[PDB]
Every structure is written in C-alpha cells, then in structure tokens.
Amino acid sequence: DLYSRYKKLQQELEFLEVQEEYIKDEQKNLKK
Amino acid sequence: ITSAAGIISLLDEDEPQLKEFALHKLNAVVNDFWAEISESVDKIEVLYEDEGFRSRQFAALVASKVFYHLGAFEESLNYALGAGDLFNVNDNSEYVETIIAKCIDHYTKQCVENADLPEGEKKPIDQRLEGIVNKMFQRCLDDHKYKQAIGIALETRRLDVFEKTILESNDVPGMLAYSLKLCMSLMQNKQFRNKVLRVLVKIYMNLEKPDFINVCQCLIFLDDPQAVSDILEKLVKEDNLLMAYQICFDLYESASQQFLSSVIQNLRTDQTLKMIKILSGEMAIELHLQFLIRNNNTDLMILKNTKDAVRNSVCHTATVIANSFMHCGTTSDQFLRDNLEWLARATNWAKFTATASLGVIHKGHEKEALQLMATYLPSAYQEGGGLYALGLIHANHGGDIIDYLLNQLKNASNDIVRHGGSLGLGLAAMGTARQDVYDLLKTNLYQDDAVTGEAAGLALGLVMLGSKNAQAIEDMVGYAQETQHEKILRGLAVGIALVMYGRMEEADALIESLCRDKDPILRRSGMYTVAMAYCGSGNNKAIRRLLHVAVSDVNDDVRRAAVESLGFILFRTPEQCPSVVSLLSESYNPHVRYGAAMALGICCAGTGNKEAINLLEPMTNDPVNYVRQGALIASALIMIQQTEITCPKVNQFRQLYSKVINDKHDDVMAKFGAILAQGILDAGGHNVTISLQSRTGHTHMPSVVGVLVFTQFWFWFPLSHFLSLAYTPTCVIGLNKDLKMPKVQYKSNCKPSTFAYPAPKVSTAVLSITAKAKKKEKEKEKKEEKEPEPNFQLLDNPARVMPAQLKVLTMPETCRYQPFKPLSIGGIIILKDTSEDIEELVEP
Amino acid sequence: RQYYLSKIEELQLIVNDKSQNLRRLQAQRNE
C-alpha cells in the first residue's frame, strides 16, 4: 500500500523527467 | 512569561552544575527560542565536544533541537544521533518524528550505497543510526500492519528484518504473497531482487503446506534449475502428483528452454517419464493444438472479401499472411485449398511467403508436420518456404526437426533455400545455443550471399538468444562492420539485439558501441539490443536513451527503431506508456510517427487500453502511407480478442479496415496494413492472443522475439510470420489427470453470448395533386379497413476464456471436480479428482 | 505511517507540477 504508492510515485517522477528531457530536445530540434 | 534568553549566560560560566541547569532550561524552552538560541550554537557545541561534561547527552539533544528549528537537517541528525537514550527514544513529539524520518532517509541512502559496493569497501554505519532504524522497525512491527515495515526493509536492503516481518505474527501469508508481487513487478536491482526471492523461497519452503506454484515461479525468476529439479523429484517421492503436474505445466508455460533442458537432465540423472514429457513441451503443445483445432471458427467471408479486393501482389502476400494469422494453429487451410488458382497467381518471393504461411497454419502440429509439409510442398522458393514453414511449426520446440533442418541446410543449393533453412533452423533452436547449429549458421553467414546472410543473422541471433556469448557477439559485430550487402546488416541488427535479450545490465557496452557506431544499421542493432535486453522493466535509462536518439539521430530508420523499442521496454506498465507517445506520434518526420504507432501496438499488445486506440484513431488518416500501415497494424494488435462491449472501437476499426482494403485509390502500403490488421484481429479463429507477458508475470521470450521480428517487416515481408510465435492461446484447459481432459463445464459471470466471439426512385412531391391524392388514398384505405440472458455462460474443457474475462470465471463447485490451482489464471490447470465414478472423457 | 504520508505527499506535489509542465511543453511543441 504505502510502500507501493511511494515507489509508484518515484517511477512516475522519473518517467516525467525523461519525458521532459525528450520534449526539450525535440523543441530544440524543431527550432532548428 | 519567559520573554528573554539570558540562560546562555549560565551556559557561559565554569561550574558544571550551572551548565547542566542552563542546558535543561534551554531544552525546556527551546521550542520557542531558536531565533536567538541558534547564534550561541557553539556554546552548546563545546558541551558535546568536551568528553568531561556530565550531561553530554542532553547537550547533544539540545543542539539537535536547535539545529532542527534552524532548518539545518544534516547537523541536527548528526547531533541527535550523538545524544543517547533520551535523544530520540521518546518517539512521541513532532521533533522526534522529523528526526526519525531524516534518520531513516539517511540510513536507506547508506544501505543502497553499501549494497552497490558491498565487497568489504562498504562505508561503516554508525551503531546509533542502525539502532534508531531498528527501533523504528520494531515500532512499525508491533504497532500496526506490517506492510510498512516490509517496505522499509526492502528499501534499506536489510533482508533480515524483512524475513522476520514475513514470518512474524504477519496475520496471514497474504502479506508474503503481497511481498512476492511487489518484488516481482516493483523492483529494479537484479541482485537485490534475487536476494528477496531467496528469502521468499526459503519462507515458502518452511511453510507447513508449501506454496509450490509460487516457489517454482520464484525459482524460474532466480534461474535455479537444480532447486526446481530437486523439488520436483522430492514431491514425486512424497506422492503428490497433481501438484507436480500443475507445477510442471506452469514451469513450461513460463520457464525458458535452457531452464527446461536443465530440469529435464536433472530429473533424468513411470511418473518421471510423464513429468519429463510434460516439461519437454509435448503434452502442452498437443493440448493447445486440440484446443485451437476444436474451437477454430474463422469468419471466412471476410477473407473471401479480401481476396476479391486484391489486384496488387503486395496485397496478395498480405492476404496470404492474414489468412495464416487468422488460421494460426488451427490446422485449417480452407482458404488456401479453396482458392488454388489465386494462390498460385503469386510468383517469386510471394510463393515463399505462401509456403511459410501454409506451414505456420499448422503451428504446433509436431509429428504429422514432417511429412505433411512434404505432401503439401514437395522450385527453389518452394523448398525454401517449405523449410521455413517447417521450422515455424516447431517454434521453440525443435527436437529432431533441428537435426533434420541442419541436414537440409548443409545440403543446400547455394540459394534462397539457404535463407529459408537458416530461418527455420533458427526458429527451431530458439535459445538452445547448440554449438553445431551456431557453426552451420556462421558458415552460411560467412558465405556472404545477401539474402542468405539476411536469414543467417536472425538465425544466429535466435540460436544464441539471451545467451550472452562473447564469441558469438564478436563474430556477428565483426561481420556487421566488415560486410557490404546492407540486407545482411539488417539481419545482423536483430541478431545482435536478440543475443542480448533479458540481461538489461550484463553488457551495457554493446549498447554504447552500437549506438556510437557510424553505420545506421548498427545503430538500429544497438537500439533493438536495448529494447530486447531491457524488455519489461521500464528502466528509465534505456527509455531516455531511445527517446534522445529518436529526437536527435539523423537516419530515419534508426529513429523508427528507437521510438518502436519503447513498446518492448514498457509493455509491463501499459498505462504510462500511452503518455510517452502522447505527442511523439505527431512529430514532423513520418518515420517517428510510424515508430510511435508500432510502439503503441507492441506496448498494449494484448490489452485494449482504449487510449492507444484513441491515439491511433487520428493517425489512421495520416497523409503518409507507412504511417497508416503501422497505425492499423498496431491497432489490430491492441484490439485482438476484443468484443464491442470490452472496447467500443472494435467495430469501427473493423469497418475502417474493410473500407481501406476495399477502397481502390488507397495506397498499397496502407492496405498491406489493413490486411495484416484483419489477420491480427482474427488470429487463431478468435482464440490466440498477443501477450508479451506470461500469466505468472515472467517475460515470454517467444512472444517478444516474434514481435521484434515482425516489426522488422519494413524490410522483409516473409518475416511477418514471426508474429505467429506471439500468439498464446486464451483458454483454460480442464486437465485433471495426465491424459484426461474431463468434460467439466465451468461457467462465467458475464453473458457468454453477451461478451465473446463477435459477428457471424423517389415519388415526386407533386404537392399540387400528390398530397391530396395521398390523403384521399388514406381515406380509401380507412373505408377499406434477454433479462434471463446466460450471464452464467457455460463452457466446455477447451473453453476459450478471454484474458480479461479470466477473473470473472466461475469455479466448477457445482461440478463434480474442482481445480487444484486457482482458476483465476488461464493455461492448463490440474483439477483435483473427487470420489470414484470419473467419466466424460473427451479426446477428439 | 506519517513518514510514508510525508514522502508520498511531497512526491505527489512534485509529480503534479511536473505533469502540468509536461502538458505545457507538449502544447508548445505542438504549436
């Protein structure tokens, strides 16, 4: 429960970080 | 009123008793006076630094309180640990709460660091922090539910406290089961996961009535063939039988080929013969073939309509492969036999694809296939297709067919027959890693004959699948860097990718070497390698690498592969996966769009996520062609095995497939997709499902390999048959004894009819006169004048149960026999036989 | 328990802000 919630939130945060990095890189490439 | 802080003056004197009193008063009123108490700081610091003070513990406590109020957590925790007993044991106040939380965070960081480097170099852990964490563990154990304690233990390694909580009062082993699942699907350290599995296998064995199914699942995860072999031999010696049969079936369903061979050898060194047969895959394949053949019921009218909508040989080979898909494992070649002039109208590689489809249609046919192929398919392309189809029949279950195909390929005609033989042999010896097969494939690849090398690369990859062979990788990468014939590079790409399946950390250097490589084909090789190795576990490192390559890389095929590997890397968590491709499916380059569509298709391989379908819906009208093809194929993969009730877009997507196939001005590439989509939808007479995951959570190697090879159909049409491997039957077979399939009729909780197998001059107005005439004719005429729906849908033994409807399955409690393993998961389930008078044997 | 609550709430705030930022960047990239 609580531990599963904590680790799922950690995984979601990491996935959001990777998504943000991807979006930033693609924005730079689209500007080019 | 206590509106001043002159106590520091008492702290400044020389008499130790006065200092102790000042410290006591400060701690008594430190909750409000941090603002000025902090500046003194060093005055109380010297009190702890000096070892001659009587009450250094109280000085440490007051310093920790002051620093916590000031906000400096690191020194506050340091000084709280410095103080003893009264420092934090009170475990009552908010300050205690915050200090303990920070202490647990620091301890977990230290534990992860120590586990990373535990070979004597681990940094020492202060006994004070260890004591505080142990006290927290004891409190969370003896206070309330122990799940939080189980989580903290897993966080901080500390498998000892974890083992204890599981074996403590623990209430029920439902918590041991909760721990089994959490480590199974919510962990990322392979060594730590293996240690947790060791603990959970020991706890399982020590139970009064051991959970053999779960212990064997843990053993298969942990790669311990000797333990499983000993367990099986002891269970047979203990005279259990039924549990042994169910355990063997689950092992075959989830375990790998090398694991099964090791178990077989351990057992070899009556009942043992039956167990050996069951593990080897004979009984399971026969049961699956019986289920597929008996319930095989395909809507042949759809394929007839597709046949009368094809004038382009592309859509011909596509129709052949779609027929193969929708008759997969059904041993029903009605379309092929009925339309013989149409089938022979395709020449060249289309004939190779037709032969491969004919062979695959008899998937799992096993014994009869050897001469059935000869009778059916006795031309170079014809023989090559016959070999490839024969290899497809023995998918992952080669046996003597491996030796026969080796002999055939050795006596090859330096011809595409070599390509077919290499593909078939690679399919047959999937993961066997036999040295002789590898040597023959190496010789064929070194022949350097374009198509021959194209097949040889994939054959080498399959033969050494997940084997991590340094010599094999060396030879394959050297060839890839040393040869022309880009097609051979295309084959070697997936060869290298598959040679690293399941490791996800072991090498981690082939990935870098291939990604940095100049040749685009080798970059695609490296990215397929990351996809296969990191399969399942959504390691954010591999995901970020693939996404960065897709954003940045120059070659477009490499971007396609990078975007497409996301499905293989995230199929275990389908919910998040549609988010990453939310707008990656709207990049200006069509290749990334097709890659995103295929990533959605592979990702939600068997689940009608209903978000992937939404994303694909607008992509199905993309101006580009291959994007439409890929989107339709991915949608077909997602919507396999789905009725209107489950997902309300199935009928719309089928109508769209029909319109695109019948539409004449649509591109052949979009239609090759629509035909493949129909084939995927109707695969196996609506019995086989695409499930990269196994029922027990393991990663299904055949399914992942087949999906990868199929997605690698942008380069070679005949490779589409490899998606046949990914079809896993959706059935619950009533196997009670070794060869008894008793006619136990088990019901469901949704209408069987309601959810399941779907489908089977204007008269001129003339208002001047016509309205009055109509009214007059009306006058002349006047003068002339489910509720009891079978929601308890009954089913037979090989009753096709959709993977979604598995949970709503109803136990045969009213029936005479009841299941041994819980009948909430599919596959073959052993039924505990009740009192005598057992009858109703079905064996068609 | 309360330690889990604090960690989960911090992560939830971070994830909410990050998800909104992701949506904003997604719209910018769409434009």
C24 by DSSP, 3-state: which? Answer: helix
Residue type, position B130, single letter: E
- Output the CA torsion sign for B349, B430, B520, B471: negative
- Whole-angstrom CA distances from B454 to B134, B341, B406, B446 are 59, 31, 18, 11
**How many angstroms separate the CA atoms of B776 and B67, rounded?**
102
Q: Which residue of B has its CA nearest to A25?
A: B551
Residue B747 bridge partners (DSSP): B794
Residue of A nearest to C26 (CA): A23
User: B731 Cβ partners below 8 Å, 6+ apart?
Assistant: B288, B291, B295, B687, B798, B799, B800, B801, B826
Integer Cα distance of B631 and A30 in angstroms: 24
B320-B324-B326-B332 Cα dihedral, nearest 10 degrees: 110
Chain breaks in chain B (C to N over 2.5 A) after: 269, 378, 760, 785
CA atoms B665, B619, B350, B364: torsion sign: negative
CB B176 within 8 A of CB B203: yes
Tokens standing for B769?
A: 């006169």
Interchain CB distance below 8 Å, C4 and B148: yes
Is the CB of residue B280 less than 8 Å from the CB of residue B288?
no
Number of H helices, E strands in chain A: 1, 0
Cross-chain residue pair C1–B104, CB shorter than 8 Å: no
- Calculate the CA B785 to chain-centre distance: 70
Say how far apart CA B503 and CA B164 lie, in whole Å: 31
Kindly report each contact of residues B29-33 with a partner whose C-beta sits within 8 Å and lies 24 or more positions away, as own/partner: B29/B2, B30/B62, B30/B65, B30/B66, B30/B69, B31/B65, B31/B69, B32/B2, B33/B5
What is the distance between the alpha carbons of residues B692 and B701, in angstroms, rounded to a whole number?
8
B93: how many CB neighbours lie within 10 A of its CB? 12
What are the angstrom distances between the C-alpha of A25 and each of B540, B639, C29?
16, 33, 10
Scanning every residue of chain B, which has its alpha carbon at the shortest distance from the alpha carbon of C28?
Answer: B583
- Tell me how far apart the alpha carbons of residues B644 and B650 are, in angstroms, rounded to a whole number: 6
Cross-strand bridge partners of residue B645: none
Check: CB of residue B388 under 8 Å from CB of residue B352: yes
Please, what is the angle between helix B556-570 and helix B590-603, to 10°?
A: 20
Contact C26 B148 (CB under 8 A): no
CB contact under 8 A, A15 and B576: yes
Q: What are phi and psi of B690, to 5 degrees?
A: -90, 110
Residue B509 Rama label (left phi>0; alpha psi -120 to 50; beta): alpha
B147, B543, B588 member nearest A1 (Cβ): B147
- Flag if A23 and C22 touch (Cβ within 8 Å): yes
Joined tokens for residue B19: 């200092």
Name the token pair of B842.
Answer: 């079905």
Q: What's the number of CA atoms in the CB half-sphere (13 Å) around residue B712?
A: 29
How many angstroms separate the CA atoms of B60 and B45, rounded? 8
CA distance B540 to chain A (A): 7
* SS3 category, B728: strand
d(CA B3, CA B26): 13
Q: Exposure of B107 by Cβ count < 10 A (0-12 exposed, 13-18 middle, 19+ buried)? A: buried
Provide, as residue numbers in chain A, all residues whose Cβ is less than 8 Å from the Cβ of B573.
11
Closest CA to B755 of B587, B667, B643, B619: B643
State both tokens at B116: 């990373």
The A-side interface with C (CB below 8 A) comprises 2-3, 5-6, 9-10, 12-13, 16-17, 19-20, 23-24, 26-27, 30
Angstrom CA distances, B405 to B401, B458, B471, B472, B499, stand at 6, 16, 24, 21, 21
Method: cryo-EM
The H or E element spanning position B159 is: helix B159-167
Q: Which residues on C lie below 8 Å from A10 (Cβ)?
A: 11
Q: Which residues contact B776 (CB under 8 A, 6 or more apart)?
A: none
Query: How far apart (Å, rounded) are the C-alpha atoms in residues B14 and B692?
Result: 76
Q: Is residue B10 less than 8 Å (CB to CB) from chain A?
A: no
For an interface test with C, the pick among B94, B583, B586, B587 (most C C-beta atoms closer than 10 Å) comes out as B583
Rounded to whole angstroms, how far apart are CA atoms B83 and B54? Answer: 13
Q: Cβ A3–B540 below 8 Å, yes or no?
A: no
Who among B104, B140, B583 is closest to C29 (CB)? Answer: B583
d(CA B652, CA B681): 13
DSSP state of B264: H
Is B258 within 8 Å of B334 (Cβ atoms)?
A: no
According to DSSP, residue B366 is labeled: G
Contact B101 C6 (CB under 8 A): yes
3-state secondary structure of B734: strand
Task: Please give the Cα distance from B90 to B82 (Å, whole number).
Answer: 15
CA distance C26 to chain A (A): 7
CA distance B478 to B612: 39
**Which residue's entry shows tokens 């077979």?**
B733
Q: By C-alpha distance, which of B126, B196, B184 is closest to B154?
A: B196
Among chain C residues, the shortest Cα distance to B147 is held by C1
Size of interface A-C (CB pairs under 8 A): 41
Minimal Cα–Cα distance from B603 to chain C, Å? 21
Does C4 touch chain B if contact means CB atoms closer than 8 Å? yes
- Subunit contact A27:C29, Cβ cutoff 8 A: yes
Q: Which amino acid is at B75?
A: E
CB contact under 8 A, A23 and C18: no
Nearest to B104 among C1, C3, C29 (CB): C3
Q: Where are the alpha helices (DSSP H) in B517-649?
A: 520-533, 540-552, 556-570, 577-580, 590-603, 612-619, 625-638
Among candidates B148, B550, B587 on the partner chain, residue whose Cβ is nearest the Cβ of A2? B148
Rounded Cα distance, B107 and B570, in Å? 31
Nearest residue of A to residue B549, measured between CA atoms? A22
Phi, psi (deg, nearest 5) at residue B88: -140, -5
Residue with tokens 């009552």: B92
Does the beta-carbon distance from B547 to A7 stay under 8 Å? no
CA distance C5 to chain A (A): 8
Give the integer Cα–Cα distance in Å for B631 and B613. 9
What is the nearest CA distance from B682 to chain A, expressed in angstroms? 35
Please answer yes or no on whether C18 and A26 come within 8 Å at the CB atom. no
Q: Which chains touch C (3 or more CB pairs under 8 A)?
A: A, B
Q: How many residues does chain C have?
A: 31
**What's the CA gap between B227 and B235, in Å, rounded?**
12
Taking an 8 Å cut-off on Cβ atoms, the answer to whether A21 and B544 are in contact is yes
Cross-chain Cβ contact B147/A2 below 8 Å: yes
**Residue B598 — φ and ψ, nearest 5°?**
-70, -30
Question: What are the CA-CA distances from residue B100 to residues B65, B84, B95, B97 (Å)?
Answer: 13, 14, 8, 5
Select from B154, B551, B573 the Cβ nearest to the Cβ of A25.
B551
- Cβ contacts of A8 on chain B, cutoff 8 Å: 186
Residues ≥6 apart with Cβ < 8 Å to C27: none
State which H helix or E strand residue C9 sits in: helix C2-30
* Yes or no, beta carbons of C8 and A6 under 8 Å apart: yes
Of A20, A27, A30, the CB nearest to C18: A20
User: B108 at the A interface (CB within 8 A)?
Assistant: no
**C22 interfaces chain A, CB cutoff of 8 Å:** yes
CA-based nearest distance B544→chain A, Å: 6
Residues B466/B495, Cβ–Cβ less than 8 Å: no
Beta-carbon contacts below 8 Å between B and C: 17
Tokens of B357: 């489809």
Q: How far, in Å, CA of B703 to CA of B693, rounded?
A: 8
* Mutation for C interface: A1, A3, A4, A5, most C CBs within 10 A: A5
Note whether B546 and B507 are within 8 A (CB): no
Residue C5 in contact with partner chain B when CB distance is under 8 A: no
- DSSP annotation string for B62-106: HHHHHHHHHT-HHHHHHHHHHS-GGGTTT--SHHHHHHHHHHHHH
B795: amino acid identity, one letter? L
The widest CA-to-CA distance across chain C, in whole angstroms, is 45
Question: Cβ A5–C21 below 8 Å, yes or no?
Answer: no
Contact B703, B726 (CB under 8 A): yes
- From the list C8, C19, C25, the residue facing A23 with the nearest CB is C25
Contact B827, B288 (CB under 8 A): no
Q: Name all chains with 3 or more CB-CB pairs below 8 Å to chain B.
A: A, C
Pull the structure tokens for residue B84.
């003893």
- DSSP assignment letter at B255: S
How many residues are recorded in chain B? Answer: 844
Q: Which two tokens stand for residue B633?
A: 């194929």
3-state secondary structure of B435: helix
How far, in Å, CA of B811 to CA of B822, rounded? 9
- Those chains having 3 or more beta-carbon pairs within 8 angstroms of chain A are B, C
Cα B315-B319-B321 angle, rounded to 5 deg: 120
Beta sheet of B732-735, edge-to-edge order: B732-735, B827-832, B818-819
Distance CA B377, CA B374 (A): 5
- Taking Cα atoms as reference points, which of B413, B334, B412, B323 lies closest to residue B360? B323
Cα–Cα–Cα angle for B613, B615, B620, rounded to 5 degrees: 85
C-alpha B458/C-alpha B444 separation (Å) is 12
CA distance C4 to chain A (A): 6
HSE on the CB side for B551, CA within 13 Å?
25
Return the residue matching tokens 């989580």.
Answer: B151
Distance from the Cα of C25 to chain A's closest Cα (Å) equals 7
B255 with B282: CB under 8 angstroms?
no
Q: DSSP string of B518-531?
A: SSHHHHHHHHHHHH
- The C-alpha R_g of chain C, in whole angstroms, comes to 13
Whole-number Cα distances in Å, B818 to B437, B735, B741, B814, C1: 45, 11, 13, 9, 42
Residue type, B753: S
Residue type, B170: N
- List residues in chain B touching C: CB distance below 8 A: 97, 100-101, 104, 140, 144, 148, 151, 582-583, 586
